[PDB]
Amino acid sequence: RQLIRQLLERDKTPLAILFMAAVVGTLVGLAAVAFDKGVAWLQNQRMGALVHTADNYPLLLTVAFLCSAVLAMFGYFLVRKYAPEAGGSGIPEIEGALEDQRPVRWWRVLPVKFFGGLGTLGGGMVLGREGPTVQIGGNIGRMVLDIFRLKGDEARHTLLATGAAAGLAAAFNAPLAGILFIIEHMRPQFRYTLISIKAVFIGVIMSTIMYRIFNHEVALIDVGKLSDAPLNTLWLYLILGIIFGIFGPIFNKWVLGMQDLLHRVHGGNITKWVLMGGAIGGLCGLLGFVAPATSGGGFNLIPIATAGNFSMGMLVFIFVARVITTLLCFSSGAPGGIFAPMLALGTVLGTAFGMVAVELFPQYHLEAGTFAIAGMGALLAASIRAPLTGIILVLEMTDNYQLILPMIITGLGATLLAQFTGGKPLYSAILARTLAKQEA
């Protein structure tokens, strides 16, 4: 009967796990850092290479395209050849790994994802560094499990989580968001786990330090201190949330449906794929010149949008164009996350809402910049369905804590309507699609 087991041995993680966490984070850190420098380096080359042909305009549009095209192809190949399970974000893959329904083939994925994404990201494709770093991170966590031979579901699941954590952290300089990601979303939320949160911390800390040893003194998003949000204004954030809530599943459809439509194009053939890859990757580096705002990570237009420097027109355009380029890049298996491009999508849509609100309510003394920041993690709420993670992610990056109530509202408002209009966590719908082809 033994109606006890009681309470002491809560928060009692084995010292061995805790040390291994430290090493996992440190690796995922440097790994993330190195990856990050690489992508920069390569974008820079194509920037310099566009100078050797800055007079001949049509030869420029060519050297941009082909340049990103060649890098795209390299990445798409490195995936289809050596590790197919390292396409897309790779978060669903790491999630499955926690349910023991997917393997962590680190010996393959690490170099595949690293150099793979390093190519897609490098060409200036519309993908985020999270995909790579999160997965790379997760695997790095398993690598050290193996190399040190650690018994127990605890050790396995913990070091795998803290890897994916330290990975997301290093991708945004977002320590809290990393930890929150696991606990809020990334935990196998069908039953309890042996994921030691104390370890995840250690991992995230070490990783974040590693990131800050190198890429620091400068922020990924600078927005300055935006204004405040008067209580009589909050309703406007529930409205915006609802909008993200209805659009959330609609976008979730397209990402999914687009994977399908793009599969036909190549049939699964590693040549038509790698070619169609370099076609989009080429389109990106081309678009990343003729209009930089429709291509790339999106961390650029964020400040420019929040400040309201874009006209209402240029916003709607940037939105449509980025909906297109985001799908083409992600849905087509290219290694690299969809988080970052979702932040930009949300920023852009929030700003647009702000724009309108500003001229409908001069009484409220609005600044569109606040609706931008509320909207930033709103697509992450209505599509990944991980609002607490996105809300802390934005708050850690944009630093406008006075907007916490409005952000929480837009977030919830999105998560709610995403549910009620019949949508589902995108990183779950993808693992579900992958396990439904394994069994069906």
Partner: antibody, heavy 120, light 107 residues
């Protein structure tokens, strides 16, 4: 926390003058700043507001550049320049720092005024 | 632009009296504020959001009202209240002030 308007006085009809209130004792950015009039022994009448980053500047029902409200956060100073001054502009000009409770904005802290006299 | 019109233009009263002046709005306004303008001084934020007192305003004062009618009430006026008071709304841009009620003291 003080507001000190100035550069009022005598203007000839059709002339123009730059009123200018100097703020101090509070972070002058983060604050919407406003201008209110009071004609001799009459009632308060709002002129215009301006946000911290000078990107939103509303005026009362007026003309082309009847009023032009600027703001220099480097100097914590607010400017109002009335042009083509007719005699209804003969008034006391207050600069007011703006704020809200629940959200409907009020004129938080008022200056001491400057008088502008439209005469020959 | 809501037109606000205030109770009496001028009103006498003797310290001790309960005093009420009212603010009437053409259209419908919510959360109005009141300003006290003592002679030769500048307006001071007295009552705001209909019935909240600006820190430093004595408890003798109170605000109220709703549709197109609002009131500032001094419960047992004091002689030191001699001032012109102005109601103002900003629930519909552009904000607008009343004409003022000049409270005179009987003594």
């Amino acid at each position: 926390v003080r507001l000190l308007e100035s550069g009022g006085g005598l203007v000839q009809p059709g002339g123009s003058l730059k009123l200018s209130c100097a703020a101090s004792g509070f972070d002058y950015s983060r604050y919407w700043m406003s201008w209110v009039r009071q004609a001799p022994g009459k009632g308060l009448k709002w002129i215009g507001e301006i946000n911290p980053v000078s990107s939103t500047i509303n005026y009362t029902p007026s003309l082309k550049d009847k009023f032009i409200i600027s703001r220099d956060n480097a100097k914590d100073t607010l400017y109002l320049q009335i042009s083509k001054v007719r005699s209804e502009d003969t008034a006391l000009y207050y600069c007011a720092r703006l704020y809200y409770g629940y959200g409907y904005w009020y004129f938080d802290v008022w200056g001491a005024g400057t008088t502008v006299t439209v005469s020959s | 632009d809501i037109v606000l019109t205030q109770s009496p233009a001028i009103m006498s009263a003797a310290p001790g009296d309960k005093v009420t002046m009212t603010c009437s709005a053409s259209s419908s306004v919510s959360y109005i504020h009141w300003y006290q303008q003592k002679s030769g001084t500048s307006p001071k934020r007295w009552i705001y959001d209909t019935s909240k007192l600006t820190s430093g305003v004595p408890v003798r004062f109170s605000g109220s009202g709703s549709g197109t009618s609002y009131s500032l009430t001094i419960n047992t006026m004091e002689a030191e209240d001699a001032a012109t008071y102005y109601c103002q709304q900003w629930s519909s841009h552009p904000q607008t002030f009343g004409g003022g009620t000049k409270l005179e003291i009987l003594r």
